Each structure stands twice: as structure tokens, then as C-alpha cells.
Design a protein around this ligand. Structure first.
Ligand code: HDE
Ligand code: HDD
Ligand SMILES: [S]
Ligand SMILES: [S]
Lengths: 726, 726
């Protein structure tokens, strides 16, 4: 017995806030959280307590600390099969990572529609508000490896596996509504351009390098999704606080056979929120697992990630009524033109047990649709349909990847396919072909119908010659970039300018920088000039006179394109650093902690060492982490209570904590003599917006602080930080 | 879509300083640099200029921008074989990464011995000072994935493939002289404990988590290599500035059959140098590719990484003469007891062409020895011999991995092995077995002998029973940790204390921290007290009374264990940041660059935007990067020349740049009015050791700066950095 006698090795099986307990496998942390999929995995879950240590063949091991050798200092013997089985399994642990979205964090949960959508789709999962569909969702970056950092600037993946009663449906989306390229044939060119360059395999998790911006400069179709990636969209605060999109027009098909064009949306019920660049980049160093960690701990805390599924619906007759092509995945559909209809709610409420088995091996693919859904001729979507089945053959070792437990349907599956590597199912059918008489032709085809029918494609009219040709309707590249630009707040525009500037600064060949600046001048002159000024480049008279592209169907902005123009803040699940001193005013801390708790805001108590400190009244205060151990990057706001401030007034890390939080536009609250830190961050005596200060933490001090957190960051501070040495 | 007329897309094929040109594949950068191995790869190097784009089948492609579809807005057709090949190759690009050392950076070079070693070994590559052996070296971290960051705290790998005339020899070593564990059977337990924890796959690139410290607290044999990891050895400045070691006792065998025990060493000719932790950690976010990049740019610049191979030699009769067991890989052999004998020099002078094909697919394995070398019964080495061949079967796809070009011997290979996946060699031999008469028994066995003989194992006597039992002589765990601790300088010791304190503070279960502090009390009470204090732990009376372990054969310390105790600085290849203003004093910059050039020290010119600035005399100065884009983390020292200092005096980034450099102990030099920045880092008028200052940058000023750089960091400044908020 190596566990501590007090049982402190084992986390409580109850919701607990981030940092309060060690983290654990989902089925141990929350054994009573269940759904049909999670229950169906029971046949393969393997425990441990009270069991003997064995080989994989079931043979009990006596000494798992030594190899068999001739003499205790002699050579290891080949007959040591215990050693070789153990080292063999280790030697073969790794499987190929995903070609893109290799870095990803996943969780189990459930989806339910608000009402039956039978008038527009026969999809069973959307037929009944009392129908609950288990889901497994993986969120991801795009460029970096499985061991790359979370808070890079990149697009994010948002993939949802719906285990429906009529088959698996995978909605394989991203956190922006468009993609960089129009035709799947170019996907290896684009991906190779953004990925580490092939001579030296640099840079990881970054588009800030020559080949990416070379490609963009030569391929103006890319500029729309580039605008999104250069915006704070590219650096989300949390997977809980980004939007999701299904990227293409698909179709819904109802029982009567009518097709409706649809684009899919996920609205984050925790609101939209992003980091700022210096913070996100520094955070890849201080905690490269910050989003994986945050997702896991939100679920352990009961702050379940929730998202509302929404559809933009376009009648077949209106296919051609927009300035842009509905099939062009570089174009978005503005919500001012086509609103998002709410459809239902997804809640992610349990972590996996084993990350490799459930996360790394999960396979999502947008061809996995069900009756009630269908594709369109979007030529990026079209090529995706080939890729996501093909790539599993090496990634997951063969064509039986649907038998890997996470991937299995909960719906019945029966057919005449046989064999392949790793075959698990033992087929008893006398027949392995159809038509057959020897098993009365079972399993049998099923006519399409209103429910439980076989899949039949919508009979879309095709007409044209066999051509490798881009549609002329796809040949417009600047108006959507411009619509996005004009829809952002002035601070968001500034962050976009700074994103392009920083990235182009890492492009070693200056002519590539110049060429990208020329493209910017085709989108918006102000944008182009500000990026130019940062790069020491002067626009030509010609560039200064490029006429801007047309409005999009008469729109000069659409505020739904902004993260922040329409407030949607939610403080629950956010976190506040509390900077302790060795004699804290206990009445301040009582008022602070209870106000945070009442709003579901977490706290972490920090100090200059671990262990404990004692408050003015003798309360013992446990310390979560040191100032350097848990940097302001990791929190949403900072509170300093009154007390013996002289203890930390000259601590460089304490001061730097405030300067860093200040620079990144985070709310900061100072009570009593903690106001002496005003000098550190240069705050006027009479105060400033975004700094909460009072004689004590009572009265309106916590409300004012929470009000600031609800608006996420203090954008008004931007001109003040410019000159801060931090 | 083409190259600029001015040819600026293409790097000069001549040595150039870091940042002066885009980096490039080795064979294009340095086409005249050759060795026998580099030439033998010419069969598979593929160019590109003037060639038509084709499928893999050699069919020319007319339109690589589009999928074949029925109409230009129609569905993609299954007959588009050009799309499917392209997409299929892309879908299957990734192979499994290495179970450990997945993150690594490699280059080509050559080795030659200083003198014939035929008195001690018949190994052909050590037989003649004029026989040059091509090498391919890969440097690595251990825990993180192939997309994890370089400047983590971790052991580093240092693996060298020697392409000798008598076969491949791989010396597969690390940058510390021991390992954490004694028996290979435990390798998967230790590696699982240090790797990201299985439920949530956190943390990447870090031992700072509960399972690693749990295993260490329970397995005191690990404490020696833990001490090394917690010291600054865990965070090297560069692969060029760390030591390498072979980890085990091997044997040299001479022509007469005499066995000598040997331990291998690599001495960095650029000297020993490491980062400090705050710098290392922050640099994983600012440039997760820093070591990869620095290695590549050093080779492009002509600062070729050079290492001296060295042997510790122990005669056979001396096997039992120390107070530790020679075969125990948790024990080092102190150089005070057994000196390193210099054996020869290795020079890395060319980068690869394609990182995947040459670096990622390279296979190194310490069982790849040649006649003149042999093994010992080290029980860690014994089990490694199984693993490095086994793991290739999944990683490199089968038993023909030696036919992957980078892995091929330059020596002849012929044998009776046939088939396997992706078999390249087409054997014409009528026989595939021996003995055979049908091919007169060729290829034939070769008796052993002085040179060009067949491999025969040294006939070591084996006497003992078949046991799984650790040798009693291995059961001592504290004396080597202690010898290491006592050999460090006071600042090195502080950094070790801080490493343990930082790491344990991230262990969530407090009993684990306590158990580790109890282990530390068995090594040294001062160390144990200093860590305890940071964790808020008080040692018990019993802990205070633990008898320190014995000296190691009479040694109180061995200065060769310290990175810094004996000066060995080499500034060539180091880099300085020069912070520009909009009217640089050209006379200062002239003297600065001239002095740096004389010692082979590089410069990067930084400013608040990109583009150019013009000096006082009209000289146009291109800007390498902004203050934010290339932070003081990435350089060895900072110089601020005179001129229009008002331009940058109030720039927050310029000020921070000096605060960060100062905090990280780097030399700083300030000329003329740049002395105004003294106020940001609180230097008194009198000056301070480590800050160079004068009216202008002259002979004296640059000599002083260069002397400081030869000492790497300004350790005396440590007392003054607590206070700086940076
Ligand atoms: C709409 C959201 C989106 C878009 C437009 C694309 N990806 Fe994705 N992708 C693969 C291929 C592929 C192609 C051929 C295209 C356009 C032609 C896209 N992508 C764009 C893949 C290589 O087959 C992929 C890698 C492993 C795998 O199973 O499939 C793949 C991954 C991927 C994910 C991750 C799913 C997961 O396992 O977590 C996501 C969210 C996307 N793509 C979205 C996506
Ligand atoms: C019995 C298991 C085992 C043990 C005990 C060790 N190794 Fe190992 N090592 C492996 C099993 C392994 C491996 C699993 O076989 C790897 C990764 C896959 C590879 O080809 O080999 C590897 C890779 C690997 C590499 C990377 C080579 C490259 O660049 O490709 C290095 C430098 C080392 N090891 C160094 C060491 C040192 C200094 C050890 C202490 C003596 C050591 N290994 C013990
Ligand atoms: S998309
Ligand atoms: S080792």
C-alpha cells in the first residue's frame, strides 16, 4: 500500500472547480453521467483496482521490476517473454497523427432539438424534441502536430459525431464560415504552404512564414479566410467561446422530397471571446495545453460547454439571388440576408476515460450523412468526400475503423462486407453477397420513406461537359473580405492590422510582403495603408486609387461578423487571480470569494511560494500556485485584497503580474492599501475605466468588477498600454 | 505567378549570417560540400526547375487548379484520377512518430580520429587519422511530440550514425551521463510516468506533473538524472553548447582480443551553455523552433557544430574497483577518477534537403555496432538492444528500413534476406539460403581478425542462475545526486532548487511533493531545506537528522560536472540584438559591427517597424525584425547605439527588451545617449558589472562587451533581478 492513508490521492466523484482536485478519467470523476453511447462503451472499459498485474495473455507477473538474466549482473535472456511483450507494446504505441487538425481536445455529451423539423427534413435526430442524440465532439487547431500548442493563431476545427438511431452523422465544421480555397484539388497546395516548410520543418503552429503568404499573394481567393485568421477569431479564449460553422451549403430533404439548401451554425452559449496576440503567443509557452486543460476542467466543474445548432435555410428557387455563388466555400451568407433559425442545443458533459483510445482514434468525416440530409456541388465539399474515408486506411490501420469503439454506431449495422485488418465482428450469415437465396437475401435493402427508409440521393439535374474549370461565378475575391473588415469594431480592426503586420514581418523575402500589401489595397485602403506603415512600405499612387469592391447585396456591414460589436458576455466558468499577502484582510476575501462563487466565477489564490498564509483574523488560506507558476495569461481578471501589502509591494513577479494583466486589457481590482500598486501600472489618482478601486471589497466593488468581466476586456485601455514596458 | 525579376526569391549558395537570406535545402545552399554519404544519396535527390508537373505515373498535368466535373458548377467525377492520386498521397503523408525523442533536428557531417586507436580497438573508423567517416546526427528532446517545442526542460538526445567502411555504427547518446532507471523492463513505466497523463494527454514537453513526481518519489534510483534535469543542463542554449554521453559501459576489443571497458563522451567545441528557466519557458512560446532554427542557421553561416569524441577507459581487471557498479547506468564515472581521453573530431557542415525523408525517417539504434566494439551486461543497454529494431517495424513500415536512403550503409551489404514490404533491392543471387552449392555459397561468412573480419562476440564468462533480480551493487541511490549537487556553483545550485520548486508546485497532490522533499533530505539537507521552504513544507526532526550519503571514492566534488565552474566560452556563432533609432550614429555602428565580425558574432538589427531606417551618414539600414518580433530571448546580448534616442526612449517594447535581457542575465551595452535606458533597469551612475557604457562604441567598449559574452551570462547580477518587474 503506496496510496496515502488519508485517501487524498483520489479526486472526489462530484463536480469541483478548476484546481481543487486532481483531474481524472470521465467515468471515475462522474460515474452517474450517462448516455446511450457512453453506456454502449461499457463492454470495452477496463478497470484496475483489486486486479492482478498480467501479461496481455492473462499470465500473472511476479516481478515487474526486472528482466530475466543469467546471474543478477548477467546478460538478459531471450526467453524473457514478459519483458519482450511489455517492450513490444510500448515500441508500437504510436499511430500516424491526422494530416491536418492533429492537435485536438474532445468530450462526450448530448443533443436535443427544440422542435420537430419534419416539415423540412426527414432526419430522425431532428424529428422529435424528446429525442436525445449522444454526441462526441473534438475541437482542434489545423496546422500543428498532436504535440503542438493550443493558443496559436490558426483556424479551429469543431467536429461533432452524432450517434443517431438512423446512422452516424458527422458535422465536420470550423470556427469561421468559409475556407481559404475554392476547389479540393488545391487542398495539398494550400496545406503544404501553411505547414512547416519542407527543408527544415519550421515553423510549428504558425502561418507567419514565407510559403503561406507566397500562396496567399498568388491566390486571392484565400483572402477572406485570411482576414478571419488575422482577426482575434484566430486566437479564441476557449473552445467554449468561439462560433462553429459547417462551411458548405448542404441540403435538407423532407418526406415529400423537397430540398432546401442549408448552412450549419453553432452559437456558443457562453458567448464569443478571444485572447489578444501577445497574450496568446506567450501562453503557448507558459501553458501549451491551455485549451485542452480549460475544456476538461470546465466539464469537471459542471460548467458544461453548451452550443445552439442553427440553420441558414435557402429555398431551391433562391439559388441565384445573391451576388455570390451559394456553392463557393470562400463566401459567407450574411445573417442580415439569411438569418440563422435556432434548431436545438448540444451540451458536453463528460470527459473521456483514455485520450488515445477515444480522442486520438475517433474518425469524423462529412460524407457520414443520414437520410434527410444530402450534399451539393460545392467543389471543396465534393473532394472532402474522397479524403476522409481514404485517410483512415493508414491512420487507423485499415477499413474496420468503424469497429474502433468510439467510432461504432449505436444504430444497427449489417452488411456483406468482410475481413480487413483488425476484424472484430464475427459474421454468422451463410451469405457474404447479395442477391442471395441461401439466407433469404438478408440483410435486405430498404426503400426510402418518411422514417427508417434507405438512403436515396436527391435527383439534382446535372448538365454540362466533362471539364476542369472554375465557375466564373466564383471569380470575385475582395467583397467578402471587405464586408468582414467593415463589420469589425475599431479595436478589432486594429488587431487585424496588427496580425497582418506581425505575420508579414516574419516573411523573409520582402517582395512577398509587398505583394500581400497590394492585395490588401484591393480590399480596403485604410487597412492597406496601416499594414503598409507597419512594414515601412509606401503605397503607390495606383494602389491609392484602386476602386474598392462592391457591397455584398447592398450590405455595408453585418454586425454578426464581429466578436464584440453586440455584447454577449457570460462570466460563469471564467477565473480570477487573487494575489495574496502574508496578512490578508479576511473581510475583503470573504466578500470577494462569495461574490465570485454566486456568479460561477472561479478563483485561484496566488502567492510567492506554495503552502499557506494566515489572514488578519487567523483564517488559514491555501495557496493554489505561485505568481510565476500561474501567470496572468491564464485568468480573466486580477483582484488584490488589502492587508500587509508591503509583503508583495516589492516582489517583481507580483508587480509584473499586474503589468501583464494590464497590457492584455484585463479588469483589475485593488482594495484598501492594494491601491499602492496603482503606481506600478501608472493609474491616475482619480482612477480610470477598467480599474476597480475602493477602501474595501464590499459595497459595489464586486459588482463593478463582474460588470467589467461580463464585457471581457477593457478595449478603451488600448492607447494607454502602447507605452507600457511589459 | 512568378519569381521577382531581381532574383531575390533565391538564397545565395554561399555561407551567410542568420537572417541574411531565406534558408534552403542543403544541396542548394552548399552544393560544393560533399562526403561519401551525401554523394550516395544522389540516386534519389529529385530537382524541379524546368521540369513539367506530372502525376506519380509520369503523366503531364494541364490544369492543377481544378477537379474534373460535369459542368463548371457540377459534381466532381470519379474518373478524376489526377485529383485522386494527389489527394491520396496527401491523405497518407504521416507516419508514426518515434515513441520517445519524437522532436529532433538533424544534419550531415564527418568524423575523423586524431590518431590510430589500434592498441585498444580494431574498429576501422578509429584506425587512421586520415580516414574520414561521414555521419548524420540527430539531436532531440525526449518526452514531447514531433510538433512540441525545443527549449523545454527535458533530457536531450544526441544520436550519431557513422557510415564506416565495416558497417553502420550508431552511437545513440543523451546530454547527461546517466539515465533515470536501472533495468529496461521499467522503461515503459518511467516513460509513461513522464509523458502526458493518459486521461487527458497533458502536459506536453514537461515533467512538471503528478505522475512523473509520483514515480520518482517511489523509485529513488531516478534521483541522479532528476538532479541533472532540474539543473540548467535541462535547458541548453543550443545543441552546439551541450555535452553528449553514451550512457553505458561498452567494450573496445583490439586485434589481440583484449577487452577494455569504455564510456563515450562528446565535448562541444563551442563550449557548455544553457538558458535560465523563465527565458527557456517563454521561448517555447515566442519560438517553439528555436534549437531547430539555430542549428540550421549555424550550419548555413559556417559556424559548423564541432564535437570532440572522448573515451573513459577502464581495464577489465578494474571492473570492481569503484564504489559503484560499472554496469549501473544511474551512476556516472567521475572524470577526476577516470579522465576522458580525446579521440577525434566531428564536424556537422550540411543541412539535409527534405526533413521528412532524411530526418523523420532516420533510424538509429545502439545495437548497430561494428567489429572492434562490443556490449556489456548493463541491464538497461541489454533491453535497448531489443527495442530499437522492433520499433522500426511499425514506425518505418517494415523490415526494409535500411533501404530508406538516409539509413543505407555506404559499406557493401549482401545476405540471404528477401522480400518484406516496399522491398527495393532486387536480388539476382540464385540462392536465398546457405549453405548452398548453387551459388558456390556466396555471399560467404568471414572469419574474425585484425581488420575486415566477421563479427564475433567477446567471450565474456557468464555464471549465475536464471533470475529476475536487481544486482545488490545497484542499490545505492543518493551518493551520485550528492556528488553532482556539491560540484555545482552557488548560482547553479539556486537554479536546481528553483527547478525542483517550480516543478513540485505543479504537482496537485501534496503528499507527492512531501515524499520528493523526503528524498531530497537523503541527498543534501541544504538542498532539501531550500526546496521545502518554497513549498511551505517544514522538515521533521528525523529528516534533519538523516546522515548524508558517502563521498564517491573520496571525492567531495568534481568540477567537470558543472556547466560553468571552469570557463570554456566561445562567442563565435553567438548573436547580438542592436536596437536601432531613426538616426543611428553610423560611427557607433561601424565599430560595433567591425568588432563583432572579428570574433564571428552575428547581429540582428531591430526597430519598432519593418522596412529601413537611414543612419546619420545616409547609410540605409534594413530592419531584420521588430522589438516584439525578435525578443531578447533569441539573442545573447543587446547593444543600443547612439543617435536619435528620443525616437525609442519611451517605446514600451524597447524598454521591455532591456528589462527582459537584464532579468535573464545577458550583457547589455549602451553608447552615448542610449545611457538614458540605465533608468529602466536601475543601474547606478558608477555603472555595474555586466552593463557596458561609454560616450561612444569604440575599441574598449566592444572589448568589454565581448569579454562579458565569452562568460555567457552575468551571474553576479542574480541578487538584483528579484526586484525587476519583467
Ligand atoms: C468545413 C470545415 C472544414 C473544411 C472546409 C475542411 N476541413 Fe478537413 N480534413 C481532411 C481533408 C480535407 C479536405 C480534402 C478539405 C477540402 C478539400 C478539407 N479538409 C477542408 C482530412 C485530411 O481527411 C482530415 C484529416 C484527418 C481526418 O480524419 O480527416 C481532416 C480533418 C478535419 C477536422 C478534424 C476532425 C477530427 O478528427 O477532429 C475538421 C474539423 C476538419 N477537417 C474541418 C474541415
Ligand atoms: C528499452 C527501452 C529504451 C531504453 C531503456 C532507452 N531507449 Fe533510447 N529509444 C528507445 C528505447 C529505449 C526507442 C523506443 O527504441 C526509441 C524511439 C524509437 C526509436 O527508434 O528508438 C529510442 C530513441 C532514442 C533516441 C533518439 C535517436 C533519434 O534521434 O532517432 C536517443 C538519443 C536515445 N533513445 C537515447 C537513449 C539514452 C541515452 C538512453 C539511456 C541509456 C536510452 N535511450 C534508453
Ligand atoms: S468550409
Ligand atoms: S544512459
Amino acid at each position: 500500500s503506496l496510496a496515502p492513508e488519508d485517501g487524498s490521492h483520489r479526486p472526489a466523484a462530484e463536480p469541483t472547480p478548476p484546481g481543487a482536485q486532481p483531474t481524472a478519467p470521465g467515468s471515475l470523476k462522474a460515474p452517474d453521467t450517462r448516455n446511450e453511447k457512453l453506456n454502449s462503451l461499457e463492454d470495452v472499459r477496463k478497470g484496475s483496482e483489486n486486479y492482478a498485474l498480467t501479461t496481455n495473455q492473462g499470465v500473472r507477473i511476479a516481478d515487474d521490476q526486472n528482466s530475466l538474466r543469467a546471474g543478477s549482473r548477467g546478460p538478459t535472456l531471450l526467453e524473457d517473454f514478459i519483458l519482450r511483450e511489455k517492450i513490444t507494446h510500448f515500441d508500437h504505441e504510436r499511430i500516424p497523427e491526422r494530416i491536418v487538425h492533429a492537435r485536438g481536445s474532445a468530450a462526450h455529451g448530448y443533443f436535443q432539438p427544440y422542435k420537430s423539423l419534419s416539415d423540412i427534413t426527414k432526419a430522425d435526430f431532428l424529428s422529435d424534441p424528446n429525442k436525445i442524440t449522444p454526441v462526441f465532439v473534438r475541437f482542434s487547431t489545423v496546422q500543428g502536430g498532436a504535440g503542438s500548442a493550443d493558443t496559436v493563431r490558426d483556424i479551429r476545427g469543431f467536429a461533432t459525431k452524432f450517434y443517431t438511431e438512423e446512422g452516424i452523422f458527422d458535422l465536420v465544421g470550423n470556427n469561421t464560415p468559409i475556407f481559404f480555397i475554392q476547389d479540393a484539388h488545391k487542398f495539398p497546395d494550400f496545406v503544404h504552404a501553411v505547414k512547416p516548410e519542407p527543408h527544415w520543418a519550421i515553423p510549428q503552429g504558425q502561418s507567419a512564414h514565407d510559403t503561406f503568404w507566397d500562396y496567399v499573394s498568388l491566390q486571392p481567393e484565400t483572402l477572406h479566410n485570411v482576414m478571419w485568421a488575422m482577426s482575434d477569431r484566430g486566437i479564441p479564449r476557449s473552445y467554449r467561446t468561439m462560433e462553429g460553422f459547417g462551411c458548405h451549403t448542404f441540403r435538407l430533404i423532407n418526406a415529400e422530397g423537397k430540398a432546401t439548401f442549408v448552412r450549419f451554425h453553432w452559437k456558443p452559449l457562453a458567448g464569443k471571446a478571444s485572447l489578444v496576440w501577445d497574450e496568446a503567443q506567450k501562453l503557448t509557452g507558459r501553458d501549451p495545453d491551455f485549451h485542452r486543460r480549460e475544456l476538461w476542467e470546465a466539464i469537471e466543474a459542471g460548467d458544461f460547454p453548451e452550443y445552439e445548432l442553427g440553420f441558414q435555410l435557402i429555398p431551391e428557387e433562391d439559388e441565384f439571388k445573391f451576388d455570390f455563388d451559394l456553392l463557393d466555400p470562400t463566401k459567407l451568407i450574411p445573417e442580415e440576408l439569411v438569418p440563422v433559425q435556432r434548431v436545438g442545443k448540444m451540451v458536453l458533459n463528460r470527459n473521456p476515460d483514455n485520450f488515445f483510445a477515444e480522442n486520438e482514434q475517433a474518425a469524423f468525416h462529412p460524407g457520414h450523412i443520414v437520410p434527410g440530409l444530402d450534399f451539393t456541388n460545392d467543389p471543396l465539399l465534393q473532394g472532402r468526400l474522397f479524403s476522409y474515408t481514404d485517410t483512415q486506411i493508414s491512420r487507423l490501420g485499415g477499413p474496420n475503423f468503424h469497429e474502433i469503439p468510439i467510432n461504432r454506431p449505436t444504430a444497427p449495422y449489417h452488411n456483406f462486407q468482410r475481413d480487413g485488418m483488425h476484424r472484430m465482428g464475427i459474421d454468422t450469415n451463410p451469405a457474404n453477397y447479395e442477391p442471395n437465396s441461401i439466407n433469404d437475401n438478408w440483410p435486405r435493402e430498404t426503400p426510402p420513406g418518411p422514417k427508417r427508409g434507405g438512403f436515396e440521393s436527391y435527383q439534382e439535374r446535372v448538365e454540362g461537359n466533362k471539364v476542369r474549370e472554375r465557375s466564373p461565378s466564383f471569380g470575385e475575391y475582395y467583397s467578402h473580405p471587405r464586408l468582414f473588415w467593415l463589420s469589425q469594431t475599431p479595436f478589432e480592426q486594429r488587431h487585424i492590422v496588427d496580425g497582418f503586420s506581425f505575420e508579414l514581418s516574419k516573411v523573409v523575402r520582402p517582395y512577398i510582403r509587398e505583394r500581400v500589401v497590394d492585395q490588401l489595397a484591393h480590399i480596403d485602403l485604410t487597412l492597406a495603408q496601416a499594414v503598409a506603415k507597419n512594414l515601412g512600405i509606401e503605397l503607390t499612387d495606383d494602389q491609392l486609387n484602386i476602386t474598392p469592391p462592391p457591397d455584398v447585396n447592398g450590405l455595408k456591414k453585418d454586425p454578426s461578423l464581429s466578436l464584440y460589436a453586440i455584447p454577449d458576455g457570460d462570466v460563469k466558468g471564467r477565473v480570477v487571480a487573487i494575489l495574496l499577502n502574508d496578512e490578508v484582510r479576511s473581510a475583503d476575501l470573504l466578500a470577494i470569494l462569495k461574490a465570485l462563487k454566486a456568479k460561477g466565477v472561479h478563483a485561484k489564490l496566488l502567492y510567492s511560494r506554495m503552502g499557506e498564509v494566515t489572514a488578519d483574523d487567523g483564517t488559514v488560506l491555501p495557496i493554489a500556485a505561485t505568481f510565476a507558476g500561474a501567470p496572468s495569461l491564464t485568468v480573466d481578471a486580477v483582484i488584490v485584497p488589502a492587508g500587509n501589502i508591503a509583503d508583495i509591494a516589492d516582489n517583481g513577479d507580483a508587480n509584473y503580474y499586474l503589468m501583464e494583466a494590464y497590457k492584455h486589457l484585463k479588469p483589475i481590482a485593488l482594495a484598501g492599501d492594494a491601491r499602492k500598486f496603482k503606481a506600478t501600472i501608472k493609474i491616475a489618482d482619480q482612477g480610470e475605466e477598467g480599474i476597480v478601486e475602493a477602501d474595501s471589497a464590499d459595497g459595489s466593488f464586486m459588482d463593478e468588477l463582474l460588470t467589467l468581466m461580463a464585457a471581457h476586456r477593457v478595449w478603451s485601455r488600448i492607447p494607454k498600454i502602447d507605452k507600457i514596458p511589459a
